[PDB]
Amino acid sequence: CVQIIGGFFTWTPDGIPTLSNITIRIPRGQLTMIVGQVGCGKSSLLLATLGEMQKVSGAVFWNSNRSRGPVAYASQKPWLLNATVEENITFESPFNKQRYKMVIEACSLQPDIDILPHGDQTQIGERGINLSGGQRQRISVARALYQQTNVVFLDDPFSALDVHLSDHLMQAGILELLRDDKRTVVLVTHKLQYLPHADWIIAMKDGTIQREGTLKDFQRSECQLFEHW
Ligand SMILES: Nc1ncnc2c1ncn2[C@@H]1O[C@H](COP(=O)(O)OP(=O)(O)OP(=O)(O)O)[C@@H](O)[C@H]1O
């Protein structure tokens, strides 16, 4: 799907590229884990592949299985439309009882709605009943998974929740959704407990790509020693 050759990303409308020499691809039928340090150009790569940055020096050939499809996404900072929880998650799409139950189970929405006086009918966000960081992160994650897109981007949903139970439940739900729906995904986070197992990692470290390959290259780079310790 994703194809980048020149690899230029610039927030300034002229000069000073924040991400350069990035030559990576994200082929369809995949579940990509993203591994990298803090502030090394991780979310910038996701936005550049989305086409929300100045594409000055590089090529972007997009085609699903250069035309863009409705790619699902959820930024690191979440976003909760001031409406009901059902509308905040379905997001102007047809409502199905089967898939809503599956999503609300994997995303742990029944315990969450219990913390609310209405749940699937309460108001949330600005000018509404307040929320918590974990609840907002999980609500955003559910909306990305329920939208039935050719891809699904999860910008650090595991980092948001310190608890291991929520992280393990979310990881199991992501695996189940990807296996039972056959849709690509990409998790941009720092949770290395699963990335070298059955994911095709790609590292853009210190403002440039290090290696864009499969899990085989993880045994030929001498870098996962800290992830396994
Ligand atoms: N929206 C933006 N506007 C301006 N500069 C940006 C923006 N996003 C990223 N940058 C710049 O590009 C750099 C790359 O950041 P990067 O993508 O690694 O962030 P991150 O690891 O996702 O962030 P965080 O620490 O919040 O989790 C940033 O340090 C910043 O200098």
Contact by Cβ (8 Å): 121, 9: no
Longest Cα pair distance anywhere in the chain, in angstroms? 53
Resolution of this model in Å is 3.6
Write down the H helix ranges in the chain: 43-50, 85-90, 97-106, 110-114, 133-146, 157-160, 164-181, 195-198
Q: What technique determined this structure?
A: cryo-EM
Measure the CA–CA gap between 65 and 198, rounded to whole angstroms.
22
- The residue assigned the tokens 């936005």 is 47
Measure the CA–CA gap between 229 and 225, rounded to whole angstroms.
6
Measure the CA–CA gap between 220 and 198, rounded to whole angstroms.
16
Measure the CA–CA gap between 140 and 72, rounded to whole angstroms.
11
Measure the CA–CA gap between 229 and 122, rounded to whole angstroms.
44
Measure the CA–CA gap between 33 and 201, rounded to whole angstroms.
5
> What are the structure tokens assigned to 62, written together?
């997009």
Return all residues near 8 (Cβ < 8 A) that are at least 6 apart.
Answer: 17, 19, 20, 22, 54, 55, 56, 57, 58
Q: Nearest residue CA, atom 19 of ligand 1?
A: 39
CA distances from 73 to 69, 93, 150 (A): 12, 15, 11
Name the residue of 44, 50, 158 whose CB sits within 8 Å of the most ligand 1 atoms, as the mutation to test its pocket.
44
Contact by Cβ (8 Å): 179, 145: no
Q: How far is the CA of 138 from the centre of ligand 1 (A)?
A: 22
Single-letter amino acid code for the residue at 74: A
